[PDB]
Amino acid sequence: RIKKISIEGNIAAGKSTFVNILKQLCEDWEVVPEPVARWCNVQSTNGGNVLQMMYEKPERWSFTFQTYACLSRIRAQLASLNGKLKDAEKPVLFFERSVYSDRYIFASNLYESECMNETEWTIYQDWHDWMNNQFGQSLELDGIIYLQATPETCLHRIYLRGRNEEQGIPLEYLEKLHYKHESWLLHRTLKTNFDYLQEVPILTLDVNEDFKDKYESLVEKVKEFLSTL
Amino acid sequence: RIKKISIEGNIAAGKSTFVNILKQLCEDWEVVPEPVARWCNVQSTNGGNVLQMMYEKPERWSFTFQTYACLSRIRAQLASLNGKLKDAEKPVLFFERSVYSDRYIFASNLYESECMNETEWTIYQDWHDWMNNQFGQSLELDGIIYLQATPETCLHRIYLRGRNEEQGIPLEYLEKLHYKHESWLLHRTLKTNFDYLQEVPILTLDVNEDFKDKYESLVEKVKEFLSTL
Ligand SMILES: Nc1ncnc2c1ncn2[C@@H]1O[C@H](COP(=O)(O)OP(=O)(O)O)[C@@H](O)[C@H]1O
Ligand SMILES: Nc1ncnc2c1ncn2[C@@H]1O[C@H](COP(=O)(O)OP(=O)(O)O)[C@@H](O)[C@H]1O
Ligand SMILES: Nc1ccn([C@H]2C[C@H](O)[C@@H](CO)O2)c(=O)n1
Ligand SMILES: Nc1ccn([C@H]2C[C@H](O)[C@@H](CO)O2)c(=O)n1
């Protein structure tokens, strides 16, 4: 089939940067970016910036955001499956984040910080289970690439990138997401409702150093990791 | 196929009352009630009462409620299709309200009353279109029964029934829903995104009088209306 790989990491760890060198390594590699742009301008399929609304008032807008974020991701991921630039021969589909990071990293953290209440979190989990019982199986992952960077590196890369919505994100929030990533992907101690994930191979790339100096090594490790699935 | 009929009306017009006499008229008739009970106790598939949360603070909770309401309805409606008490022979499936009342009566009214903002309403409409593009076609209606009662009759029936959450519902809100029902189902002037609905037969039963005295006439009219689809 199409091999499906998610790329996971903290805010500003270097996912779009990493994603932008993949297509040139192999004509058979496709990428489904996180639709962060539709989150910044909500429009049917100039509107609200729901990402901005969550960060300005997260106890008001987290559920709405998290629900919209994950639905719009599932849609973009499905559309690239049947998007039949498969046929292909040796096809790999890279997902920028996943429905699993949406729920177990981001939505979970907001619930634990009291930005979703029990009713919101119950609803979200029920929607998320149900959505994946329909429109998953097909989204299942063969592998995960974890781009690992300290919270402080990420706080600096947020400044570098300059996305308006992220400029007030405190270190404390990024550290919370860091530990949840480390639990899921380094220690593999996270309990999820998706049994096969516990067994999915993970490649861990330390991307704290500068991208130019790391590039050659990263590519070797990506190609080798791919060849084993 | 299975004939699908929705029963539409204002809050407390007499939908559950009407629904409770259907099964005894014909062994082939099934009913999918509106899951108002799961709305009053949110639980995965003692929790929050999201219905109560919407009415106590509708500008905070309308989007969440309206989104949960309609997803849980679509799920109960699907599950009764494949619920294969079809086979049957002459099978009729009655839906207590529909995805169309959810959007064009209730969600629309809350958006127009500023209980959803543009971003919420954009998201809701996008979710609703998308949900029906997947999990509809199969939910399409052959007919609609409109149970018609004045807003004042309904305000009285709310008192009679005594559902705690509805006791503070003002006449003004019920009147708004009344006119939207009258536009969709009596005048047929409502524009929707579902072209076939404009042509769907509608039976209109005036249920302002007492149910006991009306019963015999209602049954005649239901059976005849059914025989013509
Ligand atoms: N390894 C790296 N070295 C130097 N800069 C990086 C590196 N990775 C990302 N950046 C920079 O950090 C910012 C965040 O990168 P981005 O790819 O947008 O992260 P994400 O997709 O994870 O938010 C950008 O300014 C980018 O130029
Ligand atoms: N035609 C009618 N005559 C007298 N009472 C009615 C009639 N229809 C409904 N009722 C009463 O009105 C209340 C609301 O009815 P219900 O069936 O729960 O409405 P809905 O399902 O539309 O909310 C109940 O107390 C019920 O006994
Ligand atoms: N489920 C998600 C996914 C992403 N984000 C945020 C992190 C970044 O601020 C932006 C883009 O990744 O969206 C989020 O809050 N929840
Ligand atoms: N889409 C819907 C459907 C129903 N309701 C309300 C009306 C009644 O108070 C209760 C049960 O019909 O739910 C609502 O606000 N929105």
Coordinates of C-alpha atoms and ligand atoms in Angstrom, one line a residue:
Chain A
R1 CA 0.0 0.0 0.0
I2 CA 0.9 3.6 0.6
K3 CA 3.4 3.9 3.5
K4 CA 2.1 6.5 6.0
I5 CA 4.6 8.3 8.2
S6 CA 3.8 11.1 10.7
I7 CA 6.2 13.8 11.6
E8 CA 5.8 14.9 15.2
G9 CA 7.2 17.6 17.3
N10 CA 6.7 20.7 19.4
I11 CA 5.6 24.1 18.0
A12 CA 8.5 25.4 15.9
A13 CA 10.7 22.4 16.2
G14 CA 11.2 22.5 12.4
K15 CA 8.4 20.4 10.8
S16 CA 7.8 22.6 7.8
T17 CA 11.5 23.1 7.4
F18 CA 12.0 19.2 7.4
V19 CA 8.9 18.7 5.2
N20 CA 10.4 21.0 2.6
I21 CA 13.4 18.8 1.8
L22 CA 11.5 15.6 1.5
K23 CA 10.0 15.9 -1.9
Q24 CA 13.5 16.5 -3.5
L25 CA 14.8 13.2 -2.0
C26 CA 12.3 11.1 -3.9
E27 CA 9.7 11.6 -6.6
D28 CA 7.4 9.1 -4.9
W29 CA 7.1 11.1 -1.6
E30 CA 4.1 13.1 -0.9
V31 CA 3.3 15.4 2.1
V32 CA 0.1 16.5 3.9
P33 CA 0.9 19.7 5.8
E34 CA -1.0 20.6 8.9
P35 CA -3.6 23.2 7.6
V36 CA -2.5 26.0 10.0
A37 CA -3.6 28.5 7.4
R38 CA -7.2 27.5 7.4
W39 CA -7.0 27.8 11.2
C40 CA -5.8 31.3 10.8
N41 CA -8.6 32.2 8.4
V42 CA -11.8 30.2 8.8
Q43 CA -13.7 29.9 5.5
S44 CA -16.1 27.4 4.0
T45 CA -14.7 24.5 2.0
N46 CA -11.7 37.4 5.5
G47 CA -12.8 35.1 8.4
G48 CA -11.9 34.4 12.1
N49 CA -8.5 33.3 13.2
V50 CA -9.6 30.4 15.5
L51 CA -5.9 29.7 16.4
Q52 CA -5.6 33.2 17.6
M53 CA -9.0 32.9 19.4
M54 CA -7.8 29.8 21.3
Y55 CA -4.5 31.4 22.5
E56 CA -6.2 34.7 23.5
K57 CA -8.9 32.9 25.4
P58 CA -8.2 29.2 25.6
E59 CA -10.9 28.3 28.2
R60 CA -13.4 29.7 25.7
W61 CA -12.1 28.4 22.4
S62 CA -9.9 25.3 22.9
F63 CA -12.7 22.7 22.3
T64 CA -13.9 24.6 19.1
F65 CA -10.3 24.9 17.9
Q66 CA -9.3 21.4 18.7
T67 CA -12.3 19.9 17.0
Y68 CA -12.0 22.0 13.9
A69 CA -8.2 21.3 13.8
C70 CA -8.5 17.6 13.8
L71 CA -11.5 17.4 11.4
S72 CA -9.7 19.6 8.9
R73 CA -6.6 17.4 9.2
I74 CA -8.5 14.2 8.7
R75 CA -10.1 15.7 5.6
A76 CA -6.7 16.8 4.1
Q77 CA -5.2 13.4 4.9
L78 CA -8.1 11.4 3.3
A79 CA -8.1 13.6 0.2
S80 CA -4.4 12.9 -0.3
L81 CA -5.0 9.1 -0.1
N82 CA -7.6 9.0 -2.8
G83 CA -5.7 11.9 -4.2
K84 CA -4.2 9.2 -6.4
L85 CA -0.8 10.7 -6.9
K86 CA -0.6 7.3 -5.6
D87 CA -0.5 4.6 -8.4
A88 CA 3.1 5.9 -8.0
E89 CA 5.3 2.6 -7.5
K90 CA 7.1 3.2 -4.2
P91 CA 4.7 5.7 -2.6
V92 CA 5.3 7.4 0.8
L93 CA 2.8 9.8 2.4
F94 CA 4.2 12.0 5.2
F95 CA 1.6 13.5 7.6
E96 CA 2.6 16.7 9.4
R97 CA 1.3 15.7 12.8
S98 CA -1.5 13.3 13.3
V99 CA -4.9 12.7 14.9
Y100 CA -2.9 11.2 17.8
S101 CA -0.8 14.3 18.5
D102 CA -4.1 16.3 18.2
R103 CA -5.8 14.3 21.0
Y104 CA -3.0 13.0 23.2
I105 CA -0.6 16.0 23.0
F106 CA -2.6 19.2 22.3
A107 CA -6.2 18.5 23.3
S108 CA -5.2 16.5 26.4
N109 CA -2.8 19.3 27.6
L110 CA -5.6 21.9 27.3
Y111 CA -8.0 19.7 29.2
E112 CA -5.4 19.1 31.9
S113 CA -4.8 22.9 32.1
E114 CA -8.6 23.5 32.6
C115 CA -9.0 25.0 29.1
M116 CA -11.6 22.2 28.5
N117 CA -14.0 21.1 31.1
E118 CA -15.2 17.5 31.6
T119 CA -18.1 17.9 29.2
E120 CA -16.0 19.4 26.5
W121 CA -13.4 16.7 26.9
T122 CA -15.9 13.9 27.0
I123 CA -17.5 15.3 23.8
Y124 CA -14.1 15.7 22.1
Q125 CA -12.9 12.2 22.9
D126 CA -16.3 10.7 21.7
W127 CA -16.1 12.7 18.4
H128 CA -12.4 11.7 18.0
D129 CA -13.0 7.9 18.7
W130 CA -16.0 8.0 16.3
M131 CA -14.2 9.9 13.6
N132 CA -11.4 7.4 13.6
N133 CA -13.6 4.4 13.7
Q134 CA -15.1 5.7 10.3
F135 CA -12.3 7.6 8.6
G136 CA -9.3 5.9 10.1
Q137 CA -8.0 2.4 9.6
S138 CA -7.1 4.1 6.3
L139 CA -5.1 6.7 8.2
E140 CA -3.0 4.1 10.1
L141 CA 0.7 4.8 10.4
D142 CA 3.6 2.6 9.5
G143 CA 6.0 5.0 11.2
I144 CA 6.7 8.1 13.1
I145 CA 9.5 10.6 12.9
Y146 CA 9.9 12.6 16.1
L147 CA 11.7 15.8 15.6
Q148 CA 13.1 16.5 19.0
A149 CA 14.1 20.0 20.3
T150 CA 14.1 21.5 23.7
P151 CA 11.3 23.8 24.7
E152 CA 13.8 26.6 24.8
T153 CA 15.0 26.0 21.1
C154 CA 11.3 26.0 20.1
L155 CA 10.6 29.2 22.0
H156 CA 13.5 30.7 20.0
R157 CA 12.2 29.3 16.7
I158 CA 8.9 30.9 17.3
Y159 CA 10.6 34.2 17.5
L160 CA 12.5 33.4 14.3
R161 CA 9.4 32.4 12.4
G162 CA 7.3 35.3 13.6
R163 CA 3.8 33.9 13.3
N164 CA 1.8 36.5 15.0
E165 CA -0.4 34.1 16.9
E166 CA 2.4 32.3 18.6
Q167 CA 4.4 35.3 19.8
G168 CA 2.8 35.3 23.3
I169 CA 3.2 31.5 23.8
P170 CA 5.1 31.0 27.1
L171 CA 7.9 28.5 27.7
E172 CA 5.8 26.8 30.3
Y173 CA 3.2 25.7 27.6
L174 CA 5.9 24.5 25.3
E175 CA 7.5 22.5 28.2
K176 CA 4.2 20.8 28.9
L177 CA 4.0 19.8 25.2
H178 CA 7.6 18.6 25.3
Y179 CA 7.0 16.2 28.2
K180 CA 3.9 14.8 26.5
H181 CA 5.9 14.2 23.3
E182 CA 8.7 12.6 25.4
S183 CA 6.3 10.3 27.1
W184 CA 4.6 9.2 23.8
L185 CA 7.6 8.9 21.6
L186 CA 10.8 8.5 23.7
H187 CA 9.6 6.7 26.8
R188 CA 6.6 5.1 25.1
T189 CA 4.6 5.3 28.4
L190 CA 1.5 7.1 27.0
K191 CA -1.7 5.1 27.1
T192 CA -3.9 5.6 24.0
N193 CA -7.0 4.0 22.6
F194 CA -5.1 2.7 19.6
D195 CA -3.3 -0.4 20.3
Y196 CA -1.1 -0.7 17.2
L197 CA 0.6 2.6 17.9
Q198 CA 2.6 1.1 20.8
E199 CA 4.4 -1.1 18.2
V200 CA 4.9 1.6 15.4
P201 CA 8.6 2.2 14.7
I202 CA 9.8 5.7 15.6
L203 CA 12.8 7.5 14.3
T204 CA 14.1 10.2 16.7
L205 CA 16.1 13.1 15.1
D206 CA 17.6 15.7 17.4
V207 CA 17.1 18.9 15.6
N208 CA 18.4 21.3 18.2
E209 CA 21.5 22.1 16.1
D210 CA 21.3 24.2 12.9
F211 CA 19.5 22.7 9.9
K212 CA 22.3 23.2 7.4
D213 CA 24.9 21.3 9.4
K214 CA 22.4 18.5 10.3
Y215 CA 20.9 18.0 6.8
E216 CA 23.2 15.3 5.4
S217 CA 22.9 13.1 8.5
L218 CA 19.1 13.5 8.7
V219 CA 18.6 12.4 5.1
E220 CA 20.7 9.2 5.7
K221 CA 18.7 8.4 8.8
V222 CA 15.3 9.1 7.0
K223 CA 16.1 7.0 4.0
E224 CA 17.4 4.1 6.1
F225 CA 14.4 4.3 8.5
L226 CA 12.1 4.2 5.5
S227 CA 13.9 1.2 3.9
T228 CA 13.1 -0.9 7.1
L229 CA 9.2 -0.5 7.0
Chain B
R1 CA -35.8 0.7 0.2
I2 CA -36.7 1.9 3.7
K3 CA -39.0 4.9 3.5
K4 CA -37.6 7.7 5.8
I5 CA -40.0 10.2 7.2
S6 CA -39.0 13.1 9.6
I7 CA -41.4 14.5 12.2
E8 CA -40.8 18.2 12.7
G9 CA -42.1 20.7 15.1
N10 CA -41.5 23.2 17.9
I11 CA -40.3 22.4 21.4
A12 CA -43.2 20.5 23.1
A13 CA -45.5 20.5 20.1
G14 CA -46.1 16.7 20.8
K15 CA -43.4 14.8 18.9
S16 CA -42.8 12.1 21.5
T17 CA -46.5 11.8 22.1
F18 CA -47.1 11.3 18.3
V19 CA -44.1 9.0 18.1
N20 CA -45.5 6.7 20.8
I21 CA -48.6 5.8 18.8
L22 CA -46.8 4.9 15.6
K23 CA -45.4 1.5 16.5
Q24 CA -48.9 0.2 17.3
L25 CA -50.3 1.2 13.9
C26 CA -47.9 -1.1 12.0
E27 CA -45.4 -3.8 12.9
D28 CA -43.1 -2.5 10.1
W29 CA -42.7 1.0 11.5
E30 CA -39.5 1.9 13.4
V31 CA -38.7 5.2 15.1
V32 CA -35.4 7.0 15.8
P33 CA -36.0 9.5 18.7
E34 CA -34.0 12.6 19.2
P35 CA -31.4 11.7 21.8
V36 CA -32.4 14.4 24.2
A37 CA -31.2 12.3 27.1
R38 CA -27.6 12.0 26.0
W39 CA -27.8 15.8 25.7
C40 CA -28.9 16.0 29.3
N41 CA -26.1 13.6 30.5
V42 CA -23.0 13.6 28.4
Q43 CA -21.2 10.3 28.5
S44 CA -18.9 8.4 26.3
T45 CA -20.4 6.0 23.7
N46 CA -23.0 11.5 36.0
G47 CA -21.9 14.0 33.3
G48 CA -22.7 17.5 32.1
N49 CA -26.1 18.6 30.9
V50 CA -25.1 20.4 27.7
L51 CA -28.7 21.2 26.9
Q52 CA -28.8 23.0 30.2
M53 CA -25.5 24.7 29.5
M54 CA -26.7 26.1 26.2
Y55 CA -29.9 27.5 27.7
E56 CA -28.1 29.0 30.8
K57 CA -25.4 30.6 28.6
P58 CA -26.2 30.2 24.9
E59 CA -23.5 32.5 23.6
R60 CA -21.0 30.3 25.3
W61 CA -22.4 26.8 24.6
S62 CA -24.6 26.9 21.4
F63 CA -21.9 25.8 18.9
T64 CA -20.8 22.9 21.2
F65 CA -24.4 21.9 21.8
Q66 CA -25.5 22.2 18.2
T67 CA -22.5 20.2 17.0
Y68 CA -22.9 17.5 19.5
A69 CA -26.7 17.3 18.9
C70 CA -26.5 16.8 15.3
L71 CA -23.6 14.3 15.3
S72 CA -25.3 12.2 17.9
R73 CA -28.5 12.3 15.8
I74 CA -26.7 11.3 12.7
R75 CA -25.2 8.3 14.6
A76 CA -28.5 7.1 16.0
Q77 CA -30.1 7.4 12.5
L78 CA -27.4 5.5 10.7
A79 CA -27.4 2.8 13.4
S80 CA -31.1 2.2 12.9
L81 CA -30.6 1.8 9.0
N82 CA -28.0 -0.9 9.3
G83 CA -29.9 -1.8 12.5
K84 CA -31.5 -4.3 10.2
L85 CA -34.9 -4.5 11.8
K86 CA -35.2 -3.8 8.2
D87 CA -35.4 -6.9 6.0
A88 CA -39.0 -6.2 7.2
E89 CA -41.2 -6.2 4.0
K90 CA -43.0 -2.7 4.1
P91 CA -40.4 -0.8 6.3
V92 CA -40.9 2.8 7.4
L93 CA -38.3 4.6 9.5
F94 CA -39.5 7.8 11.4
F95 CA -36.9 10.3 12.4
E96 CA -37.7 12.6 15.3
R97 CA -36.4 15.8 13.8
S98 CA -33.7 15.9 11.2
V99 CA -30.2 17.2 10.3
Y100 CA -32.2 19.9 8.4
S101 CA -34.2 21.2 11.4
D102 CA -30.9 21.1 13.4
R103 CA -29.2 23.4 11.0
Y104 CA -31.9 25.5 9.5
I105 CA -34.2 25.9 12.5
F106 CA -32.2 25.6 15.7
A107 CA -28.6 26.4 14.8
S108 CA -29.6 29.1 12.3
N109 CA -31.8 30.8 15.0
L110 CA -29.0 30.8 17.5
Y111 CA -26.6 32.3 15.0
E112 CA -29.1 35.0 14.1
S113 CA -29.6 35.8 17.8
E114 CA -25.8 36.2 18.2
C115 CA -25.4 33.0 20.2
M116 CA -23.0 31.9 17.5
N117 CA -20.5 34.3 16.0
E118 CA -19.4 34.2 12.3
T119 CA -16.5 31.8 13.0
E120 CA -18.6 29.4 14.9
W121 CA -21.3 29.5 12.3
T122 CA -18.9 29.0 9.5
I123 CA -17.3 26.0 11.2
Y124 CA -20.7 24.5 12.0
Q125 CA -22.0 24.9 8.4
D126 CA -18.8 23.3 7.1
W127 CA -19.0 20.4 9.5
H128 CA -22.7 20.0 8.7
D129 CA -22.1 20.0 4.9
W130 CA -19.2 17.6 5.3
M131 CA -21.0 15.2 7.6
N132 CA -23.9 15.0 5.2
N133 CA -21.8 14.5 2.1
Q134 CA -20.3 11.4 3.9
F135 CA -23.1 10.0 6.1
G136 CA -26.1 11.3 4.2
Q137 CA -27.5 10.3 0.9
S138 CA -28.5 7.3 3.0
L139 CA -30.4 9.7 5.4
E140 CA -32.4 11.2 2.6
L141 CA -36.1 11.8 3.3
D142 CA -39.1 10.6 1.4
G143 CA -41.4 12.7 3.5
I144 CA -41.9 15.1 6.4
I145 CA -44.7 15.3 8.9
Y146 CA -45.0 18.8 10.4
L147 CA -46.7 18.9 13.7
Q148 CA -48.0 22.4 13.9
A149 CA -48.8 24.2 17.1
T150 CA -48.8 27.8 18.2
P151 CA -45.9 29.0 20.2
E152 CA -48.3 29.6 23.1
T153 CA -49.6 26.0 23.0
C154 CA -45.9 24.9 23.1
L155 CA -45.1 27.2 26.0
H156 CA -48.0 25.5 27.8
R157 CA -46.8 22.0 26.9
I158 CA -43.4 22.8 28.2
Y159 CA -45.0 23.5 31.6
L160 CA -47.0 20.3 31.3
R161 CA -44.0 18.1 30.5
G162 CA -41.8 19.7 33.2
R163 CA -38.3 19.1 31.7
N164 CA -36.2 21.1 34.0
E165 CA -34.1 22.6 31.3
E166 CA -36.9 24.0 29.3
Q167 CA -38.8 25.8 32.1
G168 CA -37.1 29.2 31.5
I169 CA -37.6 29.1 27.7
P170 CA -39.4 32.4 26.8
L171 CA -42.3 32.7 24.3
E172 CA -40.1 34.9 22.2
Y173 CA -37.6 32.0 21.5
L174 CA -40.5 29.6 20.6
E175 CA -42.0 32.2 18.3
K176 CA -38.7 32.5 16.4
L177 CA -38.6 28.7 15.9
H178 CA -42.3 28.8 14.9
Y179 CA -41.7 31.2 12.1
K180 CA -38.7 29.2 10.9
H181 CA -40.7 26.0 10.8
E182 CA -43.5 27.9 8.9
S183 CA -41.1 29.2 6.4
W184 CA -39.6 25.8 5.7
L185 CA -42.7 23.6 5.9
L186 CA -45.8 25.7 5.3
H187 CA -44.6 28.5 2.9
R188 CA -41.7 26.5 1.5
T189 CA -39.6 29.7 1.2
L190 CA -36.5 28.5 3.1
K191 CA -33.4 28.2 1.0
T192 CA -31.2 25.1 1.9
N193 CA -28.2 23.5 0.5
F194 CA -30.2 20.4 -0.2
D195 CA -32.1 20.6 -3.4
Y196 CA -34.4 17.6 -3.2
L197 CA -35.9 18.8 0.1
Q198 CA -37.9 21.5 -1.9
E199 CA -39.8 18.6 -3.5
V200 CA -40.3 16.3 -0.5
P201 CA -44.0 15.8 0.3
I202 CA -45.1 17.3 3.6
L203 CA -48.0 16.4 5.7
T204 CA -49.2 19.1 8.1
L205 CA -51.1 18.1 11.2
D206 CA -52.6 20.8 13.4
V207 CA -52.0 19.4 16.9
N208 CA -53.2 22.5 18.9
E209 CA -56.3 20.5 20.1
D210 CA -56.2 17.7 22.6
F211 CA -54.4 14.5 21.5
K212 CA -57.3 12.1 22.5
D213 CA -59.9 13.9 20.4
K214 CA -57.5 14.3 17.4
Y215 CA -56.1 10.8 17.4
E216 CA -58.4 9.0 15.0
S217 CA -58.2 11.8 12.4
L218 CA -54.3 11.9 12.7
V219 CA -54.0 8.2 12.1
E220 CA -56.1 8.3 8.9
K221 CA -54.0 11.2 7.6
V222 CA -50.7 9.5 8.5
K223 CA -51.7 6.2 6.8
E224 CA -53.0 7.9 3.7
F225 CA -49.9 10.2 3.5
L226 CA -47.7 7.1 3.8
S227 CA -49.5 5.2 1.1
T228 CA -48.7 8.0 -1.5
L229 CA -44.9 7.9 -1.2
Ligands
LIG1 N1 17.3 23.0 12.5 C1 17.0 24.3 12.4 N2 18.0 25.2 12.5 C2 17.8 26.6 12.3 N3 16.4 27.0 12.2 C3 15.4 26.1 12.1 C4 15.6 24.8 12.2 N4 14.4 24.2 12.2 C5 13.5 25.2 12.0 N5 14.1 26.4 12.0 C6 13.5 27.7 11.9 O1 12.6 27.7 13.0 C7 11.4 28.4 12.7 C8 10.4 27.3 12.9 O2 10.4 26.3 11.9 P1 9.1 25.6 11.3 O3 9.7 24.7 10.2 O4 8.1 26.6 10.8 O5 8.6 24.8 12.5 P2 7.2 24.0 12.8 O6 6.7 23.5 11.4 O7 7.5 22.8 13.5 O8 6.4 25.1 13.5 C9 11.6 28.9 11.2 O9 12.1 30.2 11.3 C10 12.7 28.1 10.6 O10 13.5 28.8 9.7
LIG2 N1 -52.1 17.1 21.4 C1 -51.8 17.2 22.7 N2 -52.8 17.3 23.6 C2 -52.5 17.4 25.0 N3 -51.2 17.3 25.4 C3 -50.2 17.1 24.5 C4 -50.4 17.0 23.2 N4 -49.3 16.8 22.6 C5 -48.3 16.8 23.6 N5 -48.9 16.9 24.8 C6 -48.3 17.0 26.1 O1 -47.4 18.1 25.9 C7 -46.1 17.9 26.5 C8 -45.1 17.9 25.4 O2 -45.2 16.7 24.6 P1 -43.9 16.0 24.0 O3 -44.6 14.8 23.3 O4 -42.9 15.7 25.0 O5 -43.4 17.1 22.9 P2 -42.0 17.2 22.1 O6 -41.6 15.8 21.8 O7 -42.4 17.8 20.8 O8 -41.2 18.0 23.0 C9 -46.4 16.5 27.3 O9 -46.8 16.8 28.6 C10 -47.5 15.8 26.6 O10 -48.3 15.1 27.5
LIG3 N1 -4.0 19.9 17.6 C1 -3.3 21.0 17.5 C2 -2.5 21.2 16.5 C3 -1.8 22.3 16.5 N2 -2.0 23.2 17.4 C4 -1.3 24.5 17.3 C5 0.2 24.5 17.5 C6 0.7 25.7 16.6 O1 0.5 26.9 17.3 C7 -0.3 25.6 15.4 C8 0.3 24.9 14.2 O2 1.0 23.7 14.6 O3 -1.4 24.9 15.9 C9 -2.9 23.0 18.4 O4 -3.1 23.9 19.3 N3 -3.5 21.9 18.4
LIG4 N1 -30.8 21.0 17.0 C1 -31.5 21.1 18.2 C2 -32.4 20.2 18.5 C3 -33.0 20.4 19.6 N2 -32.8 21.4 20.4 C4 -33.5 21.5 21.7 C5 -34.9 21.8 21.7 C6 -35.4 21.1 23.0 O1 -35.1 21.9 24.1 C7 -34.5 19.8 23.1 C8 -35.1 18.6 22.6 O2 -35.8 18.7 21.4 O3 -33.3 20.2 22.4 C9 -31.9 22.3 20.0 O4 -31.6 23.3 20.7 N3 -31.2 22.2 18.9

